[PDB]
Amino acid sequence: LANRIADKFARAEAAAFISGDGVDKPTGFLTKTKVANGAWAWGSLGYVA
Amino acid sequence: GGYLVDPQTSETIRGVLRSTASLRQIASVVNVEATSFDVLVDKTDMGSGWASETAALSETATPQIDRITIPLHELAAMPKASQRLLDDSAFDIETWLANRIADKFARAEAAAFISGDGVDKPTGFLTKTKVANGAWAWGSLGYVATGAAGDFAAVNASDAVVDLVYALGAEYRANASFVMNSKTAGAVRKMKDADGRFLWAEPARLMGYPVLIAEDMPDIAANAYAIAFGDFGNGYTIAERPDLRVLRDPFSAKPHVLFYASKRVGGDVSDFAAIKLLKFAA
Amino acid sequence: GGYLVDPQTSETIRGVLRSTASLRQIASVVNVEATSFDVLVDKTDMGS
Amino acid sequence: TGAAGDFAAVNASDAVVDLVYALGAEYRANASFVMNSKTAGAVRKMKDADGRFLWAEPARLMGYPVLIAEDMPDIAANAYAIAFGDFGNGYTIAERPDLRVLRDPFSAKPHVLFYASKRVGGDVSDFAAIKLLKFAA
Amino acid sequence: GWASETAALSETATPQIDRITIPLHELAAMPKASQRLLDDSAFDIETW
Amino acid sequence: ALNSAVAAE
Amino acid sequence: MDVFAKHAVSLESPAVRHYEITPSDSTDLARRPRALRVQTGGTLVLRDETGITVTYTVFAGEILPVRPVRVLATGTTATAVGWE
Amino acid sequence: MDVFAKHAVSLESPAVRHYEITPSDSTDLARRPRALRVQTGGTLVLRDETGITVTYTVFAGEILPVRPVRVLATGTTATAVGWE
Amino acid sequence: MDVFAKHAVSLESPAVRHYEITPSDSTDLARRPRALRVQTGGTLVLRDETGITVTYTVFAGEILPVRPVRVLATGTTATAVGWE
Amino acid sequence: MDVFAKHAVSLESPAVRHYEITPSDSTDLARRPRALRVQTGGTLVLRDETGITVTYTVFAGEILPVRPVRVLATGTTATAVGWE
Amino acid sequence: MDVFAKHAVSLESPAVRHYEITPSDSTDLARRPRALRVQTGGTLVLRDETGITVTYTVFAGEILPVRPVRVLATGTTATAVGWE
Amino acid sequence: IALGLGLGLA
């Protein structure tokens, strides 16, 4: 169980590192108010289409 | 004068060198001094909480556990050799038959590791109640279908290879391999683009993934499973004894020697999520 | 005489092997014994 | 191959790949092509519908090493210009590895007349390990 | 065989053996060199 | 590996 | 027995699969064709994936190498068969 | 003496091999052609490998870049020659 | 549902996008087409990117595989639709 | 001055070299052409490399993308020019 | 705005650059064209780079995918425009 | 344009 709980923790933190929101878990980079690149400011991530 | 010429023979009695690609080198080999082997896998996973500061914490999930029973059958051969030969045939016939029996067993267990059934031989991955991928339950191997019945797909050929690759799981593709036979590998290398150039680029790997050329998978029939792909090192468990038990009997066949040799070996699939197949149906 | 057969179990209990590509091996992993961490970045530059 | 003189026109280089994959799995682990130079030139001249030659210092073909001999027949009507296989298992050379020289100042009298010889032999040992390409039909 | 539990295993096949005779012929050449050349031709013509 | 009487065996 | 079985089917390649089309009018086609073989001459209207449509005054047996998403039934007087 | 002997024969390439076809009707063709050169104008019916068939009101000397599996004899009034 | 969705659209490939052109006369086209399907026969004038122009006495339903930058309105009597 | 000088000449490429053909009848052509431009309409007979021959009822100015080895003179009423 | 700007212009690709040709007669063309769009039907004579020439009885609006070095003026009755 | 059999644009 000490190996399998660690496995599930390393797999469940990957969802928070990517698509996680702010509540009680890390906020992933997909949830960071994306603003289109070219109109790029600091407080936002850029995308191209 | 020509009776003085005494032709020199070879050092070691040679033979035709047949295929040794036996799936044993890519799977999980386990030494076993028993009659059956029992692998214990997990078919589910746990749950994580992301627990808050001061709310609660309930019971979380615990992975349910499957026992898979390797039957560990035996494989026996008994050549009858002559006592006049063994004393007068200066090549060491005892260890030559012990090498050839070991070669025959390593070749005959390759057919049982792939398409053997349950009766006194291991069950290969092909005889494991295949279910189309997408509706994948645990007790089954998944396949994807190409399209047209005989050959690959018509308008878009060779993506059957790609979606079979990318429907196998991300961790299993880290060390995975294709398994084919030679007249399927020839047909895959014959596949070519709209201009006449074969579209694919000593292990003879495909798309970067290694390729095991068996000789015991089916060829490309109407509904055959000619190409398999996956992490056989986690998916397939071979349980065996790492020796070749030889007993010589000068007693039943009385002027003969009658080497009874038998190693014993078993195995089926241990992880159903780690092998996918290519069906040619629809 | 088939009850004396006692099948040998595995050495280690195995498991289904799920994905571990977790973005932890490419990002900046920092050990921290506190309630929070404060990365201090520079959002502009100087002039010459 | 197909057509009598050349390779098979509609689909070409398939006579190569079924020759490779009609040789066995173990022998292809260390096998080699055997050709001559004007056959290897005719192979390298093969190109797709774009004019680009499709076969991408030992001058290997399809990953497999190639021995450019000079004593095979060229691409004739019913010739066997390309061989392929594990000749290390398939073909056996038996010889004396020394070159016996006897100089003779006695027969040809103002001359020295070096009589040199070595003895050598060999045919196929393993018939399963050599495959040929016939250009007939 | 894939021998059963109680099957009374009879004989099996045993590979028949072929001898192929390498004949070991000989290959001979006899060049004719001048004794005036060998004495006056400072390159080592014998080993050449 | 059989009798020495038959040549091919 | 096709000698071109291993060859991939590009857009430039000949018609492997053919199916007759109906002027469906605001229901898209099942599969969009690489080309249209016209059966009976007339006019027919064709819509792209970007949505713009024009009328084509087509002749009787012409193939036209256009790749339409939907054939509408408003101005369609011409029957065609799709090639793919 | 062809200077294009080493070139591969694609589907887009010209007709290397030609053979006249008969309206066989529930026996498939020997080799399926890349294209059909029509000899006499009329109607002819063509079946794919997927099985669906349509009638083609074809003209006299047209080539039609379709790749049929079987030409049936029910509605076939037009004689053609296959190209491959 | 296109089976050729992953395929790249080359210049040789069939017409994905079509738009009717107007004889703009010293204002260039929005997108230059791979080919021009003519709607009504007549004459039309076409300019390259290098600037040289000729008159084309075109027929009714012909496709002409030219890639023009601007269609002028001086000698244009023929209506066409661009393919791209 | 050709800007396409470095480009390779495939089978799909346009006609670089042209030569008029005579209905030779059991003497093969000097070079087999990629295509045949017909000059005068009629019938002409064409033989493959595999030997089978058919009659083509060809029209006046058609190009036919066939690659013949020999044009016989028995049924040939039509004059053509080879393209290669 | 061309979406095919990055694409290379092959021999099989559509006509990027067009220029009207004159029957120059023993002065070679400035640039040899990939194809010839004929303006007025008639006869025109074409020479390869190897030097052999034939007369083409061409029709009115045909494109002919030939790549000529020089168009002579002896038998040329037909006006054409080159494509490249 | 050129000499293929291909249902295509050019």
Side-chain angles (χ1 to χ4, degrees):
Chain A
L1 295 184
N3 295 320
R4 185 67 63 190
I5 289 171
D7 193 1
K8 179 60 173 67
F9 283 174
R11 190 167 65 250
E13 68 182 4
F17 290 157
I18 293 170
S19 181
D21 52 355
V23 282
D24 293 331
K25 62 182 72 66
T27 84
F29 61 94
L30 297 178
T31 63
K32 290 300 293 185
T33 180
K34 280 79 60 184
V35 177
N37 196 0
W40 181 72
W42 177 258
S44 64
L45 271 72
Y47 64 91
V48 298
Chain B
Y3 287 117
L4 274 69
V5 302
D6 59 11
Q8 179 172 356
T9 185
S10 175
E11 291 85 5
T12 302
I13 171 167
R14 295 179 180 178
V16 58
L17 193 64
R18 296 174 183 269
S19 178
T20 64
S22 174
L23 193 145
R24 179 177 172 179
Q25 67 267 14
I26 68 168
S28 294
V29 175
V30 179
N31 189 0
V32 176
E33 294 182 352
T35 192
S36 297
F37 185 60
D38 292 333
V39 289
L40 291 174
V41 301
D42 306 335
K43 60 184 287 184
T44 56
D45 60 350
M46 292 183 181
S48 294
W50 294 108
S52 295
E53 178 71 31
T54 48
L57 51 94
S58 68
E59 299 297 326
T60 195
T62 299
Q64 58 178 356
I65 297 162
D66 194 2
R67 173 179 287 174
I68 302 168
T69 64
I70 308 296
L72 187 53
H73 300 288
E74 78 175 357
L75 176 58
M78 188 179 71
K80 181 175 73 175
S82 176
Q83 183 65 44
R84 189 175 301 171
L85 188 73
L86 268 66
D87 294 333
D88 296 332
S89 66
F91 303 95
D92 197 2
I93 297 299
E94 290 88 354
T95 189
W96 174 63
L97 293 180
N99 289 321
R100 188 64 62 193
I101 282 168
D103 193 6
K104 180 63 175 69
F105 288 171
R107 187 168 66 248
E109 73 183 4
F113 285 155
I114 291 169
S115 180
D117 50 355
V119 282
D120 293 331
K121 66 175 73 66
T123 74
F125 54 87
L126 297 174
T127 62
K128 297 301 291 184
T129 182
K130 280 81 62 181
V131 170
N133 196 359
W136 182 74
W138 175 253
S140 65
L141 272 71
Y143 62 89
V144 297
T146 61
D151 203 0
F152 291 93
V155 152
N156 188 352
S158 64
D159 64 9
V161 194
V162 78
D163 62 0
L164 170 138
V165 175
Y166 287 89
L168 185 269
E171 189 70 27
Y172 290 138
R173 281 185 285 112
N175 45 6
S177 69
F178 291 94
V179 179
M180 294 185 285
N181 52 357
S182 67
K183 70 186 295 293
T184 304
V188 169
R189 189 62 63 87
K190 283 178 183 181
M191 292 193 292
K192 63 182 73 67
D193 57 3
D195 293 331
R197 187 178 182 181
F198 58 95
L199 77 160
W200 300 109
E202 291 86 4
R205 63 184 61 245
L206 191 148
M207 204 188 290
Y209 295 101
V211 173
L212 190 143
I213 303 298
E215 293 294 326
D216 296 323
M217 298 195 78
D219 49 353
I220 305 101
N223 295 317
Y225 296 93
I227 304 171
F229 173 70
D231 190 359
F232 289 86
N234 291 318
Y236 196 80
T237 293
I238 293 164
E240 70 182 5
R241 290 178 183 266
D243 52 353
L244 198 279
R245 295 182 290 112
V246 178
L247 177 72
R248 60 184 296 275
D249 168 59
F251 311 127
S252 178
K254 187 63 72 177
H256 299 285
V257 183
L258 193 59
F259 294 96
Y260 175 74
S262 68
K263 74 185 292 292
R264 56 185 306 170
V265 65
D268 61 353
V269 290
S270 179
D271 195 359
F272 292 92
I275 296 166
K276 300 296 181 183
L277 283 79
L278 191 62
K279 193 179 180 180
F280 292 95
Chain C
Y3 286 111
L4 278 74
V5 295
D6 61 11
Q8 172 174 353
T9 189
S10 176
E11 292 87 2
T12 305
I13 174 167
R14 298 183 184 179
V16 67
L17 195 60
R18 296 178 186 270
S19 180
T20 60
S22 175
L23 190 145
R24 184 175 174 180
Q25 74 267 17
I26 63 170
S28 292
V29 178
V30 175
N31 191 357
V32 50
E33 294 181 355
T35 193
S36 294
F37 189 71
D38 290 333
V39 280
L40 283 168
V41 297
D42 306 335
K43 63 185 289 183
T44 56
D45 59 349
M46 298 182 185
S48 294
Chain D
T1 63
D6 202 0
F7 296 100
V10 175
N11 276 244
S13 64
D14 299 77
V16 176
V17 68
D18 63 358
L19 168 135
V20 173
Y21 288 99
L23 185 269
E26 183 65 31
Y27 289 145
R28 282 184 282 110
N30 45 5
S32 66
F33 286 98
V34 177
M35 293 183 285
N36 59 1
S37 68
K38 70 183 295 295
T39 303
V43 169
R44 187 63 65 87
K45 287 178 184 180
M46 289 191 286
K47 58 185 72 66
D48 58 356
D50 295 332
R52 186 183 177 93
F53 58 94
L54 78 161
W55 299 109
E57 295 88 4
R60 62 184 66 251
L61 192 151
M62 203 186 288
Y64 294 97
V66 171
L67 191 144
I68 302 299
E70 294 296 329
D71 293 320
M72 298 191 76
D74 50 356
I75 305 101
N78 294 320
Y80 299 93
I82 303 171
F84 179 72
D86 191 3
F87 293 90
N89 293 318
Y91 198 83
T92 298
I93 297 165
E95 68 187 7
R96 290 181 186 267
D98 56 353
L99 197 274
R100 294 180 287 115
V101 175
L102 178 71
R103 58 186 295 275
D104 169 65
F106 307 108
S107 175
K109 182 56 69 179
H111 299 283
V112 189
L113 197 59
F114 295 92
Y115 176 71
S117 68
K118 66 182 287 293
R119 65 185 304 169
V120 68
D123 55 357
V124 289
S125 176
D126 197 357
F127 290 86
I130 295 167
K131 296 299 181 184
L132 278 73
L133 189 62
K134 192 175 181 181
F135 290 95
Chain E
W2 294 107
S4 297
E5 184 75 30
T6 58
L9 184 64
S10 66
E11 302 295 327
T12 195
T14 302
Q16 59 186 0
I17 292 164
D18 195 3
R19 172 179 283 175
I20 299 166
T21 60
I22 307 292
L24 187 54
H25 305 286
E26 74 175 1
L27 179 61
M30 189 172 71
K32 183 172 72 176
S34 178
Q35 182 63 44
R36 187 173 297 171
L37 188 67
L38 266 64
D39 290 332
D40 299 334
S41 67
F43 296 101
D44 197 0
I45 301 298
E46 292 88 1
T47 192
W48 176 65
Chain F
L2 267 304
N3 50 1
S4 68
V6 175
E9 292 180 354
Chain G
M1 187 271 288
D2 47 351
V3 75
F4 300 101
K6 298 282 102 175
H7 284 274
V9 174
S10 68
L11 273 71
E12 309 169 0
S13 66
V16 179
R17 186 174 183 179
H18 67 269
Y19 58 94
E20 53 90 17
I21 49 95
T22 63
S24 296
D25 204 333
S26 70
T27 59
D28 288 331
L29 293 176
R31 289 176 288 111
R32 62 182 292 176
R34 289 186 291 168
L36 294 174
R37 172 61 182 266
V38 181
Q39 297 298 106
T40 304
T43 63
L44 80 166
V45 292
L46 264 55
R47 188 181 296 275
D48 288 329
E49 76 274 12
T50 186
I52 186 167
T53 180
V54 302
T55 69
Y56 287 101
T57 305
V58 80
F59 287 94
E62 290 183 354
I63 57 99
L64 66 161
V66 67
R67 187 168 172 82
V69 172
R70 181 169 63 235
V71 176
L72 282 76
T74 63
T76 299
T77 63
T79 61
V81 53
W83 281 351
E84 185 177 3
Chain H
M1 187 271 288
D2 47 351
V3 75
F4 300 101
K6 298 282 102 175
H7 284 274
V9 174
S10 68
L11 273 71
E12 309 169 0
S13 66
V16 179
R17 186 174 183 179
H18 67 269
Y19 58 95
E20 53 90 17
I21 49 95
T22 63
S24 296
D25 205 335
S26 70
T27 59
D28 288 331
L29 293 176
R31 289 176 288 111
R32 62 182 292 176
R34 289 186 291 168
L36 294 174
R37 172 61 182 266
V38 181
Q39 297 298 106
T40 304
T43 63
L44 80 166
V45 292
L46 264 56
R47 188 181 296 275
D48 288 329
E49 75 274 12
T50 186
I52 186 167
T53 181
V54 302
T55 69
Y56 286 101
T57 305
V58 80
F59 287 94
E62 290 183 354
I63 56 99
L64 66 161
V66 67
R67 187 167 172 82
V69 172
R70 181 169 63 236
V71 176
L72 282 76
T74 63
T76 299
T77 64
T79 60
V81 53
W83 281 351
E84 185 177 3
Chain I
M1 187 271 288
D2 47 351
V3 74
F4 300 101
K6 298 282 102 175
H7 284 274
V9 174
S10 68
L11 273 71
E12 309 169 0
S13 66
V16 179
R17 186 174 183 179
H18 67 269
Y19 58 94
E20 53 90 17
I21 49 95
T22 63
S24 296
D25 207 343
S26 71
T27 59
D28 288 331
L29 293 176
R31 289 176 288 111
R32 62 182 292 176
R34 289 186 291 168
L36 294 174
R37 172 60 181 266
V38 181
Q39 297 298 107
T40 304
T43 63
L44 80 166
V45 292
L46 264 56
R47 188 181 296 275
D48 288 329
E49 76 274 12
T50 186
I52 186 167
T53 180
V54 302
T55 70
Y56 287 101
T57 305
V58 80
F59 287 94
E62 290 183 354
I63 57 99
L64 66 161
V66 67
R67 187 168 172 82
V69 172
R70 181 169 63 235
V71 176
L72 282 76
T74 63
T76 299
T77 64
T79 60
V81 53
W83 281 351
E84 185 177 3
Chain J
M1 187 271 288
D2 47 351
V3 75
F4 300 101
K6 298 282 102 175
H7 284 274
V9 174
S10 68
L11 273 71
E12 309 169 359
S13 66
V16 179
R17 186 174 183 179
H18 67 269
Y19 58 94
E20 53 90 17
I21 49 95
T22 63
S24 296
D25 207 338
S26 71
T27 59
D28 288 331
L29 293 176
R31 289 176 288 111
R32 62 182 292 176
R34 289 186 291 168
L36 294 174
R37 172 61 181 266
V38 181
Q39 297 298 107
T40 304
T43 63
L44 80 166
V45 292
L46 264 56
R47 188 181 296 275
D48 288 329
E49 75 274 12
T50 186
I52 186 167
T53 181
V54 302
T55 69
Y56 287 101
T57 305
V58 80
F59 287 94
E62 290 183 354
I63 56 99
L64 66 161
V66 67
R67 187 168 172 82
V69 172
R70 181 169 63 235
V71 176
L72 282 76
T74 63
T76 299
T77 63
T79 60
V81 53
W83 281 351
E84 185 177 3
Chain K
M1 187 271 288
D2 47 351
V3 75
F4 300 101
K6 298 282 102 175
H7 284 274
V9 174
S10 68
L11 273 71
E12 309 169 0
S13 66
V16 179
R17 186 174 183 179
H18 67 269
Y19 58 94
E20 53 90 17
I21 49 95
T22 63
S24 296
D25 207 336
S26 70
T27 59
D28 288 331
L29 293 176
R31 289 176 287 111
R32 62 182 293 176
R34 289 186 291 168
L36 294 174
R37 172 61 182 266
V38 181
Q39 297 298 106
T40 304
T43 63
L44 80 166
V45 292
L46 264 56
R47 188 181 296 275
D48 288 329
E49 75 274 12
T50 186
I52 186 167
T53 181
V54 302
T55 70
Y56 287 101
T57 305
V58 80
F59 287 94
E62 290 183 354
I63 56 99
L64 66 161
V66 67
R67 187 168 172 82
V69 172
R70 181 169 63 236
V71 176
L72 282 76
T74 63
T76 300
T77 63
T79 60
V81 53
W83 281 351
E84 185 177 3
Chain L
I1 293 176
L3 281 311
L5 52 93
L7 61 83
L9 186 142

